[PDB]
Design a protein around this ligand. Sequence first.
Ligand SMILES: [Zn+2]
Ligand SMILES: [Zn+2]
Ligand SMILES: [Zn+2]
Ligand SMILES: [Zn+2]
Ligand SMILES: [Zn+2]
Ligand SMILES: [Zn+2]
Ligand SMILES: [Zn+2]
Ligand SMILES: [Zn+2]
Ligand SMILES: [Zn+2]
Ligand SMILES: [Zn+2]
Ligand SMILES: [Zn+2]
Ligand SMILES: [Zn+2]
Lengths: 7, 7, 7, 7, 7, 7, 7, 7, 7, 7, 7, 7
Amino acid sequence: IHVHLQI
Amino acid sequence: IHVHLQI
Amino acid sequence: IHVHLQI
Amino acid sequence: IHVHLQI
Amino acid sequence: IHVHLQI
Amino acid sequence: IHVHLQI
Amino acid sequence: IHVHLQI
Amino acid sequence: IHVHLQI
Amino acid sequence: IHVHLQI
Amino acid sequence: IHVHLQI
Amino acid sequence: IHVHLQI
Amino acid sequence: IHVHLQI
Ligand SMILES: [Zn+2]
Ligand SMILES: [Zn+2]
Ligand SMILES: [Zn+2]
Ligand SMILES: [Zn+2]
Ligand SMILES: [Zn+2]
Ligand SMILES: [Zn+2]
Ligand SMILES: [Zn+2]
Ligand SMILES: [Zn+2]
Ligand SMILES: [Zn+2]
Ligand SMILES: [Zn+2]
Ligand SMILES: [Zn+2]
Ligand SMILES: [Zn+2]
């Protein structure tokens, strides 16, 4: 599972 | 599963 | 599992 | 598991 | 396990 | 286990 | 903004 | 912004 | 910003 | 910014 | 900034 | 900045 967070 | 969050 | 955090 | 933190 | 902390 | 700290 | 991911 | 990841 | 990672 | 990692 | 690493 | 390492 790949989780990417960009804010 | 790939989850991407961009805001 | 890959977790990336960019803010 | 790879965890990356960039703030 | 790879943990990277960049702030 | 590789831990990297950069502040 | 609140983002929750549960799988 | 609050981001929660649970897998 | 609060980032929580639980896997 | 609070970052929590639990695996 | 609070960084917690638990594995 | 508080950094905690537990492996
Ligand atoms: Zn990825
Ligand atoms: Zn992505
Ligand atoms: Zn990454
Ligand atoms: Zn890595
Ligand atoms: Zn690194
Ligand atoms: Zn290293
Ligand atoms: Zn949530
Ligand atoms: Zn939160
Ligand atoms: Zn948390
Ligand atoms: Zn904290
Ligand atoms: Zn802590
Ligand atoms: Zn402390």
